[PDB]
Amino acid sequence: GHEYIYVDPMQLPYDSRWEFPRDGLVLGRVLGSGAFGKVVEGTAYGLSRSQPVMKVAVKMLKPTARSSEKQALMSELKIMTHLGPHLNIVNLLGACTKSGPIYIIIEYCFYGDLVNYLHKNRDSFLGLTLLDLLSFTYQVARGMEFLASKNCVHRDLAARNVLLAQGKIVKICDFGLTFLPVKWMAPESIFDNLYTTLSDVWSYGILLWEIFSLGGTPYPGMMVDSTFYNKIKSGYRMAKPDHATSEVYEIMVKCWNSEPEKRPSFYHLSEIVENLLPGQYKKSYEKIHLDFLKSD
Ligand SMILES: CC1(COc2ccc3c(c2)ncn3-c2ccc3cccc(N4CCC(N)CC4)c3n2)COC1
Numbered sequence: 001g002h003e004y005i006y007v008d009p010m011q012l013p014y015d016s017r018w019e020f021p022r023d024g025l026v027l028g029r030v031l032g033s034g035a036f037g038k039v040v041e042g043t044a045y046g047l048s049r050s051q052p053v054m055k056v057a058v059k060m061l062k063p064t065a066r067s068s069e070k071q072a073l074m075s076e077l078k079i080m081t082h083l084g085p086h087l088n089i090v091n092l093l094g095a096c097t098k099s100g101p102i103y104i105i106i107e108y109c110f111y112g113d114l115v116n117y118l119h120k121n122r123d124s125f126l127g128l129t130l131l132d133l134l135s136f137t138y139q140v141a142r143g144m145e146f147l148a149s150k151n152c153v154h155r156d157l158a159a160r161n162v163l164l165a166q167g168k169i170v171k172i173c174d175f176g177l178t179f180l181p182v183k184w185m186a187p188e189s190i191f192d193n194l195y196t197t198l199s200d201v202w203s204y205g206i207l208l209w210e211i212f213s214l215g216g217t218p219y220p221g222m223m224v225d226s227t228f229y230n231k232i233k234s235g236y237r238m239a240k241p242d243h244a245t246s247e248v249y250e251i252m253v254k255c256w257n258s259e260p261e262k263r264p265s266f267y268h269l270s271e272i273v274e275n276l277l278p279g280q281y282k283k284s285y286e287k288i289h290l291d292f293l294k295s296d
Helices: 067-083 114-120 130-149 187-191 197-212 226-234 246-255 266-274 279-294
Strands: 025-033 038-045 053-060 092-096 103-107 162-164 170-172
Touching: 025 053, 038 103, 053 067, 067 092, 067 103, 114 162, 114 197, 130 162, 130 170, 130 197, 130 266, 130 279, 187 197, 187 226, 197 246, 197 266, 246 266
Parallel strands: none
Antiparallel strands: 025 038, 038 053, 053 103, 092 103, 162 170
């Protein structure tokens, strides 16, 4: 087996088929700021056949960029290209890699992160409807089932990183390569430092609690501290959210099995959520899925 080796995307040569002109691209208002790294609204001219002028977002390093930070961006780009495109993740459109700082052009989602959108329509939720919640839950499952398929572990699945595009299509992000999102991590991920696809299912069960309580902080009123860990190890789990059907809560509780092997697959989760949804939505989703693959 000296023969079979692991193909590490970050070593494979960059594909310049991606590369896009910098006089073709206009920067814009900042959308989000990372510790290092930032995103921006963008306008690209000639980037797409489908749209001559289109609205993007660009990821760029902050001005204080150590070189090491510089490679991280390229690696993410290489990881992105390798992953391929899927409907439920924020796809790569182009990148600028020569004669300047690196820019990765990503899809732009009009609504924004699920947390803000949910807060906005909390009142309108009887208007935002239960099916709407179910629609998102299904596409978070589908997107992840794609990600796991590529052996990609997100490590930070949550609502702030679920985005809602035009067409109410949810796109996940930051799936590409310390303070840790403790409320969202599986036990093995906190105690054992084990990050896997089965621990992203945990985070997903936390994401649903986020959804169905219409944007509620996980473990509200509970501050992470020694007692919090002593609770989680002992098996403590959040109660049912107010707006979640008995059926869905069952879905979370499955996601929070102390044993990882016991947690359902994303592929499995897509299925459970599909039977919670009108048949016409599954039709709507496939037509949209085809159309996306046909864009450009
Ligand atoms: C004008 C508005 C626009 O919102 C947005 C925000 C981000 C948008 C967006 C539209 N299209 C895309 N992205 C992205 C893209 C990549 C990201 C890679 C990493 C992190 C992101 N973040 C972090 C900050 C926040 N959670 C938003 C997502 C990213 N976002 C805000 O009202 C809608």
